[PDB]
């Protein structure tokens, strides 16, 4: 999940892209 990946480690912009529709 996004909470367990992007908030316990800093996510780069691309790592945010994975949750886009």
Partner 1 sequence: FVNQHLCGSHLVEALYLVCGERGFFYTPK
Ligand X SMILES: *C(=O)CCCCCCCCCCCCC
Binding site for partner 1 (CB under 8 A): 1-4, 6-13, 16-17, 19-21
Residue 19 CB, nearest distance to partner 1 (Å)?
A: 5
Residues in 1-21 that interact with ligand X by CB under 6 A: 3-4, 8
Interatomic CA distance for residues 16 and 2, integer angstroms: 9
Q: Nearer Cβ to ligand X, position 2 or 18?
A: 2
Largest interatomic CA distance in the chain: 23
Task: Say whether 11 sits in a helix, a strand or coil.
Answer: coil
Interatomic CA distance for residues 9 and 21, integer angstroms: 22
Contact residues for ligand X, defined by CB under 6 A: 3-4, 8
């Amino acid at each position: 999940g996004i909470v367990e990946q992007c908030c316990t480690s800093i996510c780069s912009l691309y790592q945010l892209e994975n949750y886009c529709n």
